[PDB]
Amino acid sequence: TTAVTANTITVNKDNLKQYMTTSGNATYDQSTGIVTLTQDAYSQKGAITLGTRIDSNKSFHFSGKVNLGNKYEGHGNGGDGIGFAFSPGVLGETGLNGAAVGIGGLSNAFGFKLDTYHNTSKPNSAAKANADPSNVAGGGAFGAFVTTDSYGVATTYTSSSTADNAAKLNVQPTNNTFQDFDINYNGDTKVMTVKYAGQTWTRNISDWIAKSGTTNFSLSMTASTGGATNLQQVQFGTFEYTESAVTQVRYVDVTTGKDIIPPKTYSGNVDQVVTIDNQQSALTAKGYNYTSVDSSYASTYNDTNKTVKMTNAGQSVTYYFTDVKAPTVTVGNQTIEVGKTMNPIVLTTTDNGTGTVTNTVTGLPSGLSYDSATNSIIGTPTKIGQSTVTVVSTDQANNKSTTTFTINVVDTTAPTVTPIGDQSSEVYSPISPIKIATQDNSGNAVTNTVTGLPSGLTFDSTNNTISGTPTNIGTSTISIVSTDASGNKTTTTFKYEVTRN
Ligand SMILES: OC[C@H]1O[C@@](CO)(O[C@H]2O[C@H](CO)[C@@H](O)[C@H](O)[C@H]2O)[C@@H](O)[C@@H]1O
Ligand SMILES: [Ca+2]
Ligand SMILES: [Ca+2]
Ligand SMILES: [Ca+2]
């Protein structure tokens, strides 16, 4: 087996903390997926960043909701807004507070902002942002693409097309409600489509990607307040992307080719050297011994130091282990009744491994068999006695155990006897012989003894009949005791009346 070197991941509210990191004033509510980036208070800054580089040769997609606040330019003291930034620089870094709207401060980056505070006059040098454009001045929050230069200075993107020009929001933030927000990037066309509360911005971003000097990016979502404020929040929702600059590490059963424990993904910046873990002690605890390392999908791997060096493309290292623990069968001793269909004895087996376990069974009583399909001893035992049953349990790695238990086939069921009706016949007349018919679960001989016979009548053990000529008028109770080989007994009776002619 071989896995992909770069996964296509979806970040959701439950795995968010596995893939992303909050910083500054940001907090997170896992039950709702709500990242609160700032509260409605002065001088706040909060961010969330994705801990793996995104490959822009593949599609990526944020689908969620955003609360931009409840006041904005010309309608309350609202700011600063929320920035969604894609940076060619290192993971974990965020843009600046203020007019930079979380994008200014990052070099050669691009992104999209929702901007509630119109910075009409030129921000100072330290703000790393040009003024907001005239075409969105005069009232209302607006949305826009943003790009930065090599000094980290943000320019709000404007154009002569309504497709991607900076534009006032159709749905203004008046009441702290969450609106639908979507950033969709198509890795085939390089077109980024941003949608906020039904309003769309669309642009081919091939040029900004080329200007950034790379095809793999660090994603941040950052909001701030200064003297102007707002509750600013992003709700997950989901973020889908394909990894760049990762190494996959798998822990694989050499016999089956299956993952023994979950694989691990290490992330870094391009050229970052990262130590990976072969998890030997965890595999040992699971009954596995180290076998080898295959690093053919990670040419940067150094087995002495256990390091890889991240590249744009994903790498993969596989550690192989061998299952060195035999399976266990637990089966207690059994007592079953001869000539009855037994309820199955399930040969309950457990094993530490990833493959198939095969049981082979010997020493079964006659009539019993091992059913593979149900892993059970089934059948009807035909013979009294005790057997030692041996079960040899073999896993796919050829670890073997053998277990024995006893099956005692017993007879505790008494014979059954066809009923004989009460009889009547004339004194001194020979009778039609009365047949005594028995059956038993042992399938073996039932022996009968008979008492209480009218005088002149005889029981014959050879063919189990009563016959003869009765010589006394009167009434008899004939008593038959039927015994199997095990000593189980049945008493059957009937009345015999000897009459006058
Ligand atoms: O309140 C506006 C007033 O405050 C100043 C600081 O003196 O700027 C702060 O407020 C702005 C809006 O929240 C931010 O853009 C800025 O980063 C923050 O320092 C004044 O510059 C501004 O006029
Ligand atoms: Ca602004
Ligand atoms: Ca095993
Ligand atoms: Ca019996």
Side-chain angles (χ1 to χ4, degrees):
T1 56
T2 297
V4 300
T5 56
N7 280 326
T8 296
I9 294 295
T10 302
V11 181
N12 61 44
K13 60 181 182 176
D14 283 342
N15 64 24
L16 182 145
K17 287 303 176 92
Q18 181 196 335
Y19 292 106
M20 304 190 82
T21 299
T22 52
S23 57
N25 299 109
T27 60
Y28 180 58
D29 185 347
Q30 187 186 337
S31 65
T32 57
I34 297 172
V35 186
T36 297
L37 294 172
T38 70
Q39 295 287 343
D40 190 28
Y42 301 118
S43 304
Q44 303 295 98
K45 185 189 181 185
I48 188 177
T49 59
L50 177 68
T52 301
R53 306 199 69 84
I54 293 157
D55 183 1
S56 72
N57 296 313
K58 299 286 185 266
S59 298
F60 62 78
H61 186 199
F62 178 77
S63 172
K65 293 184 171 161
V66 162
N67 169 27
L68 229 194
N70 71 337
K71 50 208 176 301
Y72 50 90
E73 184 71 16
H75 298 85
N77 183 39
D80 297 319
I82 304 168
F84 303 85
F86 299 92
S87 175
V90 299
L91 287 168
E93 176 185 42
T94 59
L96 292 180
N97 61 292
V101 200
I103 308 176
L106 301 161
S107 301
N108 296 317
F110 59 88
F112 185 91
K113 62 170 183 183
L114 292 161
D115 192 334
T116 45
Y117 185 94
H118 194 277
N119 294 85
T120 304
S121 63
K122 184 190 168 62
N124 62 23
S125 194
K128 297 294 195 167
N130 292 318
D132 293 331
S134 299
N135 86 300
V136 289
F142 69 93
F145 290 114
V146 174
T147 61
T148 70
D149 66 12
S150 56
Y151 304 99
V153 178
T155 300
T156 300
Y157 178 77
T158 62
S159 75
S160 66
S161 175
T162 61
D164 55 357
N165 192 22
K168 288 179 185 193
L169 302 182
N170 297 346
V171 180
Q172 294 289 327
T174 62
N175 57 14
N176 289 323
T177 57
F178 279 89
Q179 301 293 340
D180 290 333
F181 187 61
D182 196 283
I183 298 171
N184 182 74
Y185 170 79
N186 182 312
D188 295 326
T189 61
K190 314 252 169 278
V191 168
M192 176 170 285
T193 308
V194 179
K195 192 177 171 185
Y196 179 83
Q199 183 177 6
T200 296
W201 294 254
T202 310
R203 201 186 179 268
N204 186 319
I205 63 162
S206 294
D207 56 341
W208 300 340
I209 289 169
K211 166 182 80 70
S212 80
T214 181
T215 59
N216 51 81
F217 296 96
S218 170
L219 162 66
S220 54
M221 310 186 175
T222 300
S224 66
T225 61
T229 72
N230 263 324
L231 178 60
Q232 293 169 129
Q233 303 171 291
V234 177
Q235 185 175 28
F236 281 76
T238 54
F239 184 66
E240 299 166 75
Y241 65 102
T242 300
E243 299 172 327
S244 156
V246 293
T247 294
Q248 308 309 326
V249 181
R250 300 152 78 215
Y251 310 89
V252 176
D253 184 327
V254 83
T255 301
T256 63
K258 294 176 65 182
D259 294 285
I260 305 159
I261 62 177
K264 208 168 196 303
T265 304
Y266 291 82
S267 301
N269 296 303
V270 171
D271 292 337
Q272 185 180 341
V273 175
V274 173
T275 297
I276 67 177
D277 186 359
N278 71 9
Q279 297 201 240
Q280 184 60 56
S281 85
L283 281 116
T284 295
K286 281 174 70 81
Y288 278 87
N289 279 357
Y290 186 74
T291 304
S292 63
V293 53
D294 178 353
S295 64
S296 53
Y297 292 95
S299 66
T300 70
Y301 178 68
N302 176 311
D303 194 39
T304 299
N305 302 339
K306 307 282 185 300
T307 57
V308 291
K309 183 172 193 184
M310 300 302 179
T311 51
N312 175 48
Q315 290 171 78
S316 183
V317 175
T318 298
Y319 294 107
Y320 285 104
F321 301 81
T322 305
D323 174 354
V324 297
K325 245 168 57 81
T328 317
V329 173
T330 313
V331 172
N333 293 329
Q334 312 290 333
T335 291
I336 56 172
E337 185 76 19
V338 68
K340 305 260 71 192
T341 49
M342 73 189 305
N343 38 42
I345 299 163
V346 190
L347 300 178
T348 309
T349 111
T350 56
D351 191 60
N352 68 309
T354 67
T356 65
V357 173
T358 303
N359 289 151
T360 54
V361 184
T362 61
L364 285 180
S366 322
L368 303 200
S369 62
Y370 173 66
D371 181 56
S372 297
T374 62
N375 187 43
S376 296
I377 293 161
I378 64 175
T380 297
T382 56
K383 188 176 178 167
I384 300 305
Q386 181 159 293
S387 291
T388 296
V389 185
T390 299
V391 189
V392 173
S393 189
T394 302
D395 70 21
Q396 202 167 327
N398 295 122
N399 299 282
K400 271 199 190 304
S401 61
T402 71
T403 319
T404 61
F405 64 96
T406 52
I407 294 176
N408 197 27
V409 181
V410 297
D411 193 344
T412 56
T413 315
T416 60
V417 180
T418 299
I420 302 161
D422 290 345
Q423 308 287 310
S424 186
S425 68
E426 290 179 32
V427 71
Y428 309 131
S429 286
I431 70 161
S432 206
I434 298 161
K435 175 80 175 78
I436 301 165
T438 62
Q439 45 288 332
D440 194 65
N441 59 316
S442 73
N444 299 340
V446 178
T447 70
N448 302 303
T449 51
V450 175
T451 56
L453 286 167
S455 211
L457 296 180
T458 291
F459 168 65
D460 182 61
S461 58
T462 300
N463 59 23
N464 290 299
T465 62
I466 293 162
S467 64
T469 291
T471 55
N472 291 323
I473 293 167
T475 289
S476 283
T477 303
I478 287 154
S479 193
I480 303 154
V481 185
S482 305
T483 306
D484 64 17
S486 295
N488 302 308
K489 289 181 183 303
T490 302
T491 304
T492 308
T493 65
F494 67 102
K495 293 300 184 76
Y496 205 113
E497 175 162 59
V498 181
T499 69
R500 69 154 288 158
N501 66 10

